[PDB]
Design a binder for this molecule. Structure first.
Ligand SMILES: Cn1nccc1S(=O)(=O)Nc1ccn2ncc(C(=O)NC(C)(C)C)c2n1
Length: 314
């Protein structure tokens, strides 16, 4: 009927990994930067250790274990990998460290060095990961530039599967990101891969504007009515009509009319072959971002036996 999920859930010993510092904290919990040193493997894997705040309750453990399930069931270069879980009183998710943080902060902090090549390459990469989730019958339900994290300035991955559901999905109440949601999702609680396309459209808009807040100043309760009238996000200044047309197509009333992720990969790839024809940025091509071919690129985070999780297969 539905294929058995043969994913392996790795249980990791608390003694095998070490917390270095807090990267962030909030509603999600507390995310720590760490190092995982397996068995007698002679390797040190940079990791992100996630735990829900501090307070241990059966409800909090269920949500984090559901997230572990979804994450252990995915394997794509553009989707964050779950290395394992630690069965402490609290319960920790051990995922691959994305050293440069989220894309939203990245574009905000580095706008003066982000060229059109990087921007269109990010769009291709996000569509590839999103298309993988689609193949795996998975609806993200929370795609935004805050949930697209940076491994290297040239390699981004989809993260935060707290809302992700394995297959239209029928949800309930709570806290919803309205300004990233499709109309059917706001009015009828309907989530499809095509509602993820709407979220992709807003994510692209976030990148193209260099981290602008969508519908800034407008209260979330007004959004539903604004979209119903025909109002959308403006054309970012760096955007040509070619790129904005793509964004607009992601924001159509008819879900079947919106592009498919496999088409978005194609469209953005064509554009990424000639970035200056699709994005007009002052100073483009003279811009510089760190790459693994830079001095102290890896030293900027002991070493010697440090291996990235993408190169640590088991
Ligand atoms: C909650 N959230 N938001 C974006 C990502 C996440 S996450 O589910 O904690 N996933 C992951 C995975 C790897 N890495 N590496 C670094 C981070 C990180 O800086 N996270 C915060 C602090 C939440 C922005 C990370 N976060």
């Amino acid at each position: 009927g539905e294929a058995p999920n043969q994913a392996l859930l790795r249980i990791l010993k608390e003694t095998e990994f070490k917390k270095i510092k807090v990267l962030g904290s909030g509603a999600f919990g507390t995310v720590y930067k760490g190092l995982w040193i397996p068995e007698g493997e002679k390797v040190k894997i940079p990791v992100a250790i996630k735990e829900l705040r501090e307070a241990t309750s059966p409800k909090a453990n269920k949500e984090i274990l559901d997230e572990a399930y979804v994450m252990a069931s995915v394997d794509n270069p553009h989707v964050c990998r779950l290395l394992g879980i630690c069965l402490t009183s609290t319960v920790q998710l051990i995922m691959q460290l994305m050293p440069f943080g989220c894309l939203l902060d990245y574009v905000r902090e580095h706008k003066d060095n982000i060229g059109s090549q990087y921007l269109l390459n990010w769009c291709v990469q996000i569509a590839k990961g999103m298309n993988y989730l689609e193949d795996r019958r998975l609806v993200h339900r929370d795609l935004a530039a805050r949930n697209v994290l940076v491994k290297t300035p040239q390699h981004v991955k989809i993260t935060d599967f707290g809302r992700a559901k394995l297959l239209e999905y029928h949800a309930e109440g709570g806290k919803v990101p309205i300004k990233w949601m499709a109309l059917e999702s706001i009015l009828h609680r309907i989530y499809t891969h095509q509602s993820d396309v709407w979220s992709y459209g807003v994510t692209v808009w976030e990148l193209m504007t260099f981290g602008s807040k969508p519908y800034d100043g407008i209260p979330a309760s007004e959004i539903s009515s604004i979209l119903e009238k025909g109002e959308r996000l403006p054309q970012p200044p760096i955007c040509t009509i070619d790129v904005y047309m793509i964004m607009v197509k992601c924001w159509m009333i008819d879900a079947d009319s919106r592009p498919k992720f496999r088409e978005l990969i194609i469209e953005f790839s064509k554009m990424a072959r000639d970035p200056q024809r699709y994005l007009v940025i002052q100073g483009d091509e003279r811009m510089h971002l760190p790459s693994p071919t830079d001095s102290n690129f890896y030293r900027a985070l002991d070493m010697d036996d440090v291996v990235d999780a993408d190169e640590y297969l088991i």
